Amino acid sequence: PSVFRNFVEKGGAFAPEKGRYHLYVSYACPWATRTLIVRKIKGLEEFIDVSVVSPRMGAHGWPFANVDAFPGADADPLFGAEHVKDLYMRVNPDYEGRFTVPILWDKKTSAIVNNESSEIIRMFNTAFNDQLPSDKAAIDLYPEALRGEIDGINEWVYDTVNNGVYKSGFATSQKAYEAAVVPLFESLDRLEKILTGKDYLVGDQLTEADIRLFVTIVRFDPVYVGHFKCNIRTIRDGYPAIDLWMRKLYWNNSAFSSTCNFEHIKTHYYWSHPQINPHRVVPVGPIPNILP
């Protein structure tokens, strides 16, 4: 239940202006990786900067490179912040919500525009088109011919897959655990017969629906199988077409390979959850992280 739900739209308080917005993310959080993937498909590395927090979350939440100097992590360049908490309590000092990543930060106002990944990739989809080159501005991860159909698939993929892995690993009872994994793999079987032969989830063109499914499927086999007990079967050997669909987004599209740091992924989940893995031991994991 994320707060801050404002959009960067022309003629608004948050207008698409170059070098005005900063994106606080982690390479491990799948909702943050959404924003980053879309940020590179449309070439916005000149409109939105990115600070990568350390994956070893704990006690004080997401830390920055000054307190925890993990490879690939950035220090906070806007403020002297040590943890993501500092940006939330900057805007509201009695904020009782959570310190969720990603964060799209407005430098000009010094406030949070949005931290809901579904919308950030969608404002990263419109808004900035006037200032982008012709090829990168042509990309549309949400054309309205197949829009309504995307929200349909994105809705049950969100509930059973994107979030289903989380109610699997974080469940504290056997009953709640089983209530989450079975719909997860049932929807994975439904997704498996969708992507048989097809190369994309919808309409022969890469869409956000592929992206919201990719960031969780890319972490299914390394993390979600062992750490979240989503082990009915693996995407590697149980879902061959889902597997192959994922690897051609990975090896044939730069916005998925450069946005995928398995070190941050596996280190975060296994280290920052002491009540699922008390000794913070990260397995050598499935080798390799992803097949060719």
Place this chain on the structure above:
Amino acid sequence: SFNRKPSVFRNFVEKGGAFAPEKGRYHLYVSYACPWATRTLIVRKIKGLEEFIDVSVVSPRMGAHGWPFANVDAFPGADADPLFGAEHVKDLYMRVNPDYEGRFTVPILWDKKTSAIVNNESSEIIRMFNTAFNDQLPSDKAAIDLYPEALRGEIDGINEWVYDTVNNGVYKSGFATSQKAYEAAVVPLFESLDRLEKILTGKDYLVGDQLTEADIRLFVTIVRFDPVYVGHFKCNIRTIRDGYPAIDLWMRKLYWNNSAFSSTCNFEHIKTHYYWSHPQINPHRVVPVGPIPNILPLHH
């Protein structure tokens, strides 16, 4: 780092000795989840001793007081203690020696006549179940020898590094409290699994093209490798199903073609024990739906 503790009771059921092979004299305390106990049960049915040694099945939900019996924890397939009404396996060790400071492991070979423990080392128990009782068994069951002396050099050879890197290596992988000790155990394990993969390629048994104990000591670990050991012990470099086809296929030929490996294999007891009994590896005691199925069919 995980350092196992050796067994204290190491007497044998042999010739004119204190422990002679007499029908209905010995009681075997086991659990369907313990792979070292499952050794005893596999050998007990290959050589047909179900009328010489009875078996009490301990509840798989170990915890606090160690292995409990069906009277304190009523899990399906678990038995109560019929000889002394014991609540936990600890009681049988403490019965014979009230100043016994060791651990309360299973299996237990109990001498009813002395009211004492004959043996609690699985490596030797499967070897006394192979000798001793041959005079009293039928010809078919007495002919079986899981340790013929022609191959008593290959068996101890393979059994030595299979125990250290595979049988016990899986335990020092999962029970490790540090990243280095974890990595120090998983790498030799899968290295020995690669070596095991090239041995059993084409072959039907580990040594000399016949069912030996070495096949039995390796089976009890491989059959639970994919269900428990991958997720719970983070031994997930590869799975036996899709990474080691010859080890996998070797295991399924012992499972589906020999009843003494299927009837001694209760996956529920296996998966419930490891996930419920280790609150320092899985604090909320949640047992995954696991790899489906527990073991692949004989045609794959």
